[PDB]
Amino acid sequence: CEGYES
Amino acid sequence: EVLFQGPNSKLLSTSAKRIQKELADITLDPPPNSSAGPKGDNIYEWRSTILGPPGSVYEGGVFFLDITFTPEYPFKPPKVTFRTRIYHPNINSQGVICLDILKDNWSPALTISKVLLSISSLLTDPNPADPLVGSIATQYMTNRAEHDRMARQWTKRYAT
């Protein structure tokens, strides 16, 4: 998925 | 001044026809704990309310969703995003959702009721294999009790 956050 | 309030497609026929059919079914037979309908004049822009599934860490929370359809519906999935902040490994800070049927598993057979059921199921069963917030997916697997304490705290602080 697009929009990954740590 | 005079604004059409929707998309300039050549064929709104297929999308609008299917959207009105979905609107009527979901008002007749709403999924459990969920609601959805157009915000205003544009049947391509809906709004949804979801109660956090009972037994989940989200219980008692009230979550709002934005649902936008395109003129390619039902052959392209709608866009669906949380507006309420939520603490979940598959939902990022802007409410983007990582759910299979919203990208590569989308099928014209699926309806917006089904998307909401699946979203409810994703709240009770996170998918740490396709994380969208790394620390939360990590905490979900190594420190579950801390993940639940945070999801409960966030539900109380943001979803009420």
Residue numbers in the entry:
A (entry chain D): 1 to 6
B (entry chain B): 34 to 193
Question: What's in the article?
Answer:
The crystal structure of the hexapeptide crosslinked with UBE2E1 was obtained and found to diffract to 2.43 Å resolution. An L-shaped structure is employed for this peptide, where the 1st lysine (K1) and 2nd glutamate (E2) together constitute the short side of the “L”, followed by the 3rd glycine (G3) at the corner, and the remaining three residues (-4YES6-) on the long side of the “L”. The long side of the “L”-hexapeptide is responsible for the major interaction with UBE2E1, with an interaction area of 445 Å2, and extensive interactions involving the main chains were observed in this interface. The amino and the backbone carbonyl groups of E5 form hydrogen bonds with the carbonyl group of UBE2E1 L165 and the amino group of G167, respectively. The carbonyl group of S6 engages in hydrogen bonds with S168 of UBE2E1, further stabilizing the interaction. Regarding the short side of the “L”-hexapeptide, K1 (Cys1 in the crystal structure) is proximal to D163 of UBE2E1, which is conserved among other E2 enzymes and proposed to activate the nucleophilicity of substrate lysine residues for ubiquitin conjugation, whereas no obvious interaction was observed between position 2 glutamate and UBE2E1. Collectively, our structural and biochemical results revealed that UBE2E1 specifically recognizes the hexapeptide in an “L” shape and localizes it near its active site for ubiquitin transfer in an E3-free mechanism.
Ubiquitination, catalyzed usually by a three-enzyme cascade (E1, E2, E3), regulates various eukaryotic cellular processes. E3 ligases are the most critical components of this catalytic cascade, determining both substrate specificity and polyubiquitination linkage specificity. To this end, we focused on a unique human ubiquitin-conjugating enzyme E2 E1 (UBE2E1) that can catalyze monoubiquitination at K867 of its substrate protein SETDB1 independently of E3 through an unknown mechanism.
